[PDB]
RNA sequence: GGACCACCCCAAAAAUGAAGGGGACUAAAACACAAAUCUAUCUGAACUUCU
């Protein structure tokens, strides 16, 4: 019986009591909802025809008691009178079950009132510490210090041994294995015999409640009532005497037999009672054996102790004198703390992209250095430091640094200046340290707009000139023009069809601060699916070429996309406009649909009670309902809150596209006699743009300038100085982190209800016209292609041998390079000599006969891909004969087997499997940074929670800093280890665990705490001297303080492997060590109906599937 | 040490059903103008409807 998450209501805890709260207003809804749940649904109260019809009848009928009346509500002998549609003497049968329903509601009503806000900053002897006020947090605050931690473990072991006696558990493990279904009560009623409730309710329940009223002291109650159970005496001390008695070492032991009994009950509710669950039967052996169970419960109370101490440190920076942490505070706090862990992550990628752009052989980072400034010696006071930008000019890498600078920036550098460039790398490195110090100074003052302030940083002569040549209104016109050309618009439209387009649609480049809008891709893809379900009148372009259709749709998307973000979202979100005209329409289109008029079970019924009076506030209510009902649906689904919100922005867009009034975008697209006249138009303009990247200010031809005269822009940033440094960070970022940085700045604005990065998000969108997808005229040294190719068993290195290698000239084709898109990302992040070593171990090479088979099968896919689409059409919509007999089935099987063995073979010689491998290795390493950033935030929280004094702890978590008294030099791990040694100076072996001889094994193997500097600096990527399965091993050792993070390491790695089409079965041995048992590429099922003949056509090739398993296991030497 | 196959919080006279609830409160995800294609689509309830 779910109580919350049903309207907009949710349990939100407050100062005086916890409260059921309708989404926005803080009024009490606890009495309103719990009176509404006080009803007996009459289908409970009961092959598939008589049963299935009666359940639909009595689900409408509810039996409630308002007020002490048995009247029924619309949605045995007394049950049939309702079925024959025909008072109080009859319905008194149900009060036996409604009194059990009433007592559940009164117990839940008291369950919400005690779930109140706990954490309160206090001020005892001039230090600001945070304590809990709840009954449990009084126990955790007693054992808060690290000295009393061993007494906390012993009291759990003492309480566990008084409740569970090694054969009561041993019989209880047997009953969990020896059930399948409907036998839960035998486990349950035996477990109540272990606790002993039958000699508790019947002997002490009514006795002890009288004596609580008299003696008002636990010491006097035990003297008054002797011979209590050790668990019952533990329960009374928790409820009636824990708030108001002082905690001695003798009376602290009463609270632990109740804390252990909760944990054993929570294990039964998850692994026995509810759903069993779907996990295993081998899991149960690991959980419930007595020596494992005694270890697991104390490994779970020590988790709950450490989350308290971590919360007392987290709520010490974020809270004033002065305040109690209500759920309004806590939820806003988490969305600001998740903001910080995304800016720590964006400065770890920006270091990493600055290490590839300036190739360091040491892979050792970065201060201080990257400009030449001398410093005084101990003797003589005369030296010159080793600046890495001056290490260019010793190795003469300036032909290669300028090559790496071109991939990130597209500015024409001149390495002969060499003082202008060393000032440019200073302004990149000072910009990353500026947002690094912003994380520190978002503690004393909660203003996130000042972490991108970039104060006291003057831009270079390059970075000023580079920014103004990417903002001014003439250059943005030649990026709109490049996006129009690259989307094949000039080839599939007439000249006046697009001049009429450019006179109307304006290009902004304004964030508009609207939450939860769908992207237009993922919304264009729904059109042909939803075309019949909604009154759309659209025609997706269909042509018999299927490479022409991909290029018309790529022009169909881009032309409608600038309508969607530019003109549409200003119309569709103004208070004048049709938002609720469409929102009430789609709820009616689902209600008045067929087969929902049969049974009124349409899914959009839970939206009809929402009005909200504003289209912008309506989304913030739907996006609030979405965030509270995430994680309920399994497999998961097309989720309702996103599916409903994609219908509004697609019905409303196609209504905005019909009314006023451009609708010639359908027939783009149609006149084949026109496309002959525009066939070479894309080639003439692309030849111009390659002459534009070689030199900008040449000349603009007349046919170019007729488009550029009409392209209109919304807003220009006008060059403030602090955006100049924020631009240099964003060019050092891939697309996945750049949208995470786009998302985290939007979620900061919607959480704090202010606009603070509206100048920053406007500059992210001026990088949204920069992704070119024909990337990026980089050089392709032909030796570097040929480390993956084997010409007669040897790597092709000579450029003449590459022409000798192939014949069909899908490679070299002199005198040029075919320049595949896969080698862009593998070289920008290179990670190019690494994937040589992985491919050499796995034998992944491009054979001659395997490349020769490519050009044979390439002239056969167009026969196979067309024949697959034709036979699939007989399967989906026959409409004529109700055929697709078995002779069509076997012909469809041989069609998709040939597409499968070609697409696996196309992706190998087009290097798309290396672009998938590089995309997979880097996606894992960008995710594991996000766990070491949680570790850095939760490291200062445990230390500030343990020690509210000792202000030197904050001096650990600084990054230059020149101010520190005790911990001067080093990064976080190098300064934490000397904090750890001077704290445990009397408690070896813990010093010798971090001793200077032990630390060399600890650092080289990247064990317990040196994996944090290893992951966050991306030190895997040049050499990989420790494998991923040992990085993931050492990260779970690092995150062992928090169990929800130690468990979510492997869950986030399996889910990354599942996005790239792999099903991973890891094994974790008896030693803490991870190995892959099996990888399989996930099966694309064809013909999902007909229930017997599926085809399973796996996505990634088996040769790539082996090659990923080597990548996790690859270690240097 | 065994992840994937979470975690935390509140509820013990009557109301021993702790056989219950809660969590944007806490992680994982999801949402976002990168990419990638061979999975009919569309309704629904804990396989079943559709033109």
UniProtKB/Swiss-Prot annotation:
Active-site residues from the entry: 436 (for target rna cleavage), 441 (for target rna cleavage), 1012 (for target rna cleavage), 1017 (for target rna cleavage)
Coiled-coil residue spans: 844-910
Effect of mutating residue 263 to A: Wild-type pre-crRNA cleavage
Region ranges (Binds target RNA): 483-486, 554-561
Enzyme Commission identifier(s): 3.1.-.-
Region (Binds crRNA processing site): 283-292, 1036-1046, 1068-1072
Regulation of protein activity: Target RNA acts as an activator for non-specific ssRNA cleavage; the target RNA and complementary crRNA must both be at least 20 nucleotides long to activate the HEPN-like catalytic pocket for RNase activity.
Site (Binds 3'-end of target RNA, in adjacent protein): 437
Consequence of substituting residue 962 to A: Decreased cleavage of target RNA
Region annotated Binds crRNA spacer, chain positions: 511-522, 682-686, 809-821, 902-906
Stretches for region HEPN-like fold 1-II: 716-777
Segments for region (Binds crRNA spacer and target RNA): 768-774
Region (Helical-2): 473-715
Annotated site (Binds crRNA spacer): 565, 735, 865
InterPro entries given in the database record: Cas13a_endoribonuclease
Other notes: Part of a type VI-A uridine-preferring CRISPR-Cas system.
Subunit structure and binding partners: Crystals show the 3'-end of target RNA interacting with an adjacent protein molecule, and mutagenesis of those amino acid residues decreases target RNA cleavage, but it is not clear if this is physiological.
Role played: CRISPR (clustered regularly interspaced short palindromic repeat), is an adaptive immune system that provides protection against mobile genetic elements (viruses, transposable elements and conjugative plasmids). CRISPR clusters contain sequences complementary to antecedent mobile elements (spacer sequences) and target invading nucleic acids. Unlike many single-component effectors, this CRISPR-Cas system targets RNA. CRISPR clusters are transcribed from pre-CRISPR RNA (crRNA) and processed into crRNA by this protein. pre-crRNA processing yields a 5'-OH and probably a 2',3'-cyclic phosphate.
Similarity remark: Belongs to the CRISPR-associated endoribonuclease Cas13a family.
Record's protein name: CRISPR-associated endoribonuclease Cas13a
Origin species: Leptotrichia buccalis (strain ATCC 14201 / DSM 1135 / JCM 12969 / NCTC 10249 / C-1013-b)
Protein's gene: cas13a
């Amino acid at each position: 019986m779910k109580v919350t998450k049903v309207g907009g209501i949710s349990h939100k805890k407050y100062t005086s009591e916890g409260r059921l709260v309708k989404s926005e207003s803080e009024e009490n809804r606890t009495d309103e909802r719990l009176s509404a749940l006080l009803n007996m649904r009459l289908d409970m109260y009961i092959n598939q025809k008589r049963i299935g019809k009666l359940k639909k009848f009595f689900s409408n009928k509810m039996v409630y008691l308002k007020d002490n009346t048995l009247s029924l509500k619309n949605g045995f002998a007394v049950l049939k009178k309702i079925y024959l549609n025909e008072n109080s003497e009859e319905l008194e049968v149900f009060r036996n079950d409604i009194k059990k329903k009433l007592n559940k509601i009164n117990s839940l009503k008291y369950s919400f009132e005690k779930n109140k806000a706990n954490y309160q900053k206090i001020n005892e002897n001039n230090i600001e510490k945070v304590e809990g006020k709840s009954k449990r947090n009084i126990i955790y605050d007693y054992y808060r210090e690290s000295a009393k931690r061993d007494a906390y473990v012993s009291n759990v072991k003492e309480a566990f041994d008084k409740l569970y006696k090694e054969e009561d558990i041993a019989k209880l493990v047997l009953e969990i294995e020896n059930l399948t279904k409907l036998e839960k009560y035998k486990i349950r009623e035996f477990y109540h015999e272990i606790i002993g409730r039958k000699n508790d309710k019947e002997n002490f329940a009514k006795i002890i409640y009288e004596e609580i009223q008299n003696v008002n002291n636990m010491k006097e109650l035990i003297e008054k009532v002797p011979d209590m159970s050790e668990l019952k005496k533990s329960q009374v001390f928790y409820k009636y005497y824990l708030d108001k008695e002082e905690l001695n070492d003798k009376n602290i032991k009463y609270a632990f037999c109740h804390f252990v009994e909760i944990e054993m009950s929570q294990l039964l509710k998850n692994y026995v009672y509810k759903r069993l669950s779907n996990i295993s039967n081998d899991k149960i052996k690991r959980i419930f054996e007595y020596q494992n169970l005694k270890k697991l419960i104390e490994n779970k109370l020590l988790n709950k102790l450490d989350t308290y101490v971590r919360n007392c440190g987290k709520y010490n920076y974020y809270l004033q004198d002065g305040e109690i942490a209500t759920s309004d505070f806590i939820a806003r706090n988490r969305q600001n703390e998740a903001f910080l862990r995304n800016i720590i992550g964006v400065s770890s990628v920006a270091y990493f992209s600055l290490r590839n752009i300036l190739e360091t052989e040491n892979e050792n980072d970065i201060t201080g250095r990257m400009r030449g400034k001398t410093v005084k010696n101990n003797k003589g006071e005369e030296k010159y430091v080793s600046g890495e930008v001056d290490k260019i000019y010793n190795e003469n890498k300036k032909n290669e640094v300028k090559e790496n600078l071109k991939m990130f920036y597209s500015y024409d550098f001149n390495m002969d200046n060499k003082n202008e460039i060393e000032d440019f790398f200073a302004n990149i490195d000072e910009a990353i340290s500026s947002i690094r110090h912003g994380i520190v100074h978002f503690n004393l003052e909660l203003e996130g707009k000042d972490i991108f302030a970039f104060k006291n940083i003057a831009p270079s002569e390059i970075s000023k000139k580079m920014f103004q040549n990417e903002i001014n209104e003439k250059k943005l016109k030649l990026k709109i023009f490049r996006q129009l050309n690259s989307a094949n618009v000039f080839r599939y439209l007439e000249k006046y069809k697009i001049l009429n387009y450019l006179k109307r649609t304006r290009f902004e480049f304004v964030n508009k601060n609207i939450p939860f809008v769908p992207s237009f891709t993922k919304l264009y893809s729904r059109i042909d699916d939803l075309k019949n379900s909604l009154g759309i009148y659209w025609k997706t372009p269909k042509t018999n070429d299927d490479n022409k259709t991909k290029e018309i749709i790529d022009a169909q998307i881009y032309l409608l996309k600038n309508i969607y973000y530019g003109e549409f979202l200003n119309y569709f979100m103004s208070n004048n406009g049709n938002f609720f005209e469409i929102s009430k329409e789609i709820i009616e289109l689902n209600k008045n649909d067929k087969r929902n008029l049969k049974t009124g079970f349409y899914k959009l019924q839970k939206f009809e009670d929402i009005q909200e009076k504003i289209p912008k506030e309506y989304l913030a209510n739907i996006q609030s309902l979405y965030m509270i009902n995430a994680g309920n649906q399994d497999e998961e689904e097309k989720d309702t809150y996103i599916d409903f919100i994609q219908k509004i922005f697609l019905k409303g867009f196609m209504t905005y596209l019909a009314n006023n009034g451009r609708l010639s975008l359908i027939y783009i697209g149609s006149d084949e006699e026109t496309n002959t006249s525009l066939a070479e138009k894309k080639q003439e303009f692309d030849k111009f743009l390659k002459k534009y990247e070689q030199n900008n200010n040449i000349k603009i031809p007349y046919e170019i300038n007729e488009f550029l005269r009409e392209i209109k822009l919304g807003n220009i940033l006008k060059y403030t100085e602090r955006l100049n440094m924020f631009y240099l960070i964003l060019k050092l970022l891939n697309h996945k982190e750049l949208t995470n940085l786009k998302g985290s700045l939007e979620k900061y604005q919607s959480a704090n209800k202010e606009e603070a990065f509206s100048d920053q998000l406007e500059l992210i969108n001026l990088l949204n016209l920069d992704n070119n997808r024909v990337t990026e005229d980089f050089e392709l040294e032909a030796d570097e292609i040929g480390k993956f190719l084997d010409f007669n068993g040897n790597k092709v290195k000579d450029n003449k041998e590459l022409k000798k290698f192939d014949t069909n000239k899908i490679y070299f084709d002199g005198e040029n390079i075919i320049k595949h898109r896969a080698f862009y990302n593998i070289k920008k992040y290179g990670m190019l000599n690494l994937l040589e070593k992985i491919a050499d171990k796995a034998g992944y090479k491009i054979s001659i006969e395997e490349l020769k088979k490519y050009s044979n099968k390439k002239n056969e896919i167009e026969k196979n891909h067309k024949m697959q689409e034709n036979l699939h059409r007989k399967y989906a919509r026959p409409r004529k004969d109700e055929k697709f007999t078995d002779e069509d089935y076997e012909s469809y099987k041989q069609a998709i087997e040939n597409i499968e063995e070609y697409t696996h073979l196309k992706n190998k010689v087009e290097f798309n499997e290396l672009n998938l491998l590089q995309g997979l290795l880097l996606r894992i390493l960008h995710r594991l940074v996000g766990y070491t950033s949680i570790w850095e935030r939760d490291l200062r929280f445990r230390l500030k929670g343990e020690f509210p004094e000792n202000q030197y702890i904050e001096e650990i978590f600084n990054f230059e800093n020149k101010k520190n008294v005790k911990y001067k030099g080093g990064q976080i791990v190098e300064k934490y280890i000397k904090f750890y040694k001077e704290l445990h100076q009397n408690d070896e072996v813990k010093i010798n665990k971090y001793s200077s001889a032990n630390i060399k094994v600890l650092k080289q193997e990247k064990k317990d705490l040196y994996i944090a500097n290893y992951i966050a600096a991306f030190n895997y990527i040049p050499h990989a001297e420790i494998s991923l399965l040992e990085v993931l091993e050492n990260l779970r050792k690092l995150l062992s303080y928090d169990r929800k993070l130690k468990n979510a390491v492997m869950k986030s790695v399996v889910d990354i492997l599942k996005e790239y089409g792999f099903v991973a079965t890891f094994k974790i041995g008896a030693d803490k060590k991870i190995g892959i048992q099996t990888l399989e590429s996930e099966k694309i099922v064809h013909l999902k109906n007909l229930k017997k003949k599926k085809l399973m056509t796996d996505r990634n090739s088996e040769e790539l599937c082996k090659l990923v398993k080597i990548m996790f296991e690859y270690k240097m030497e």
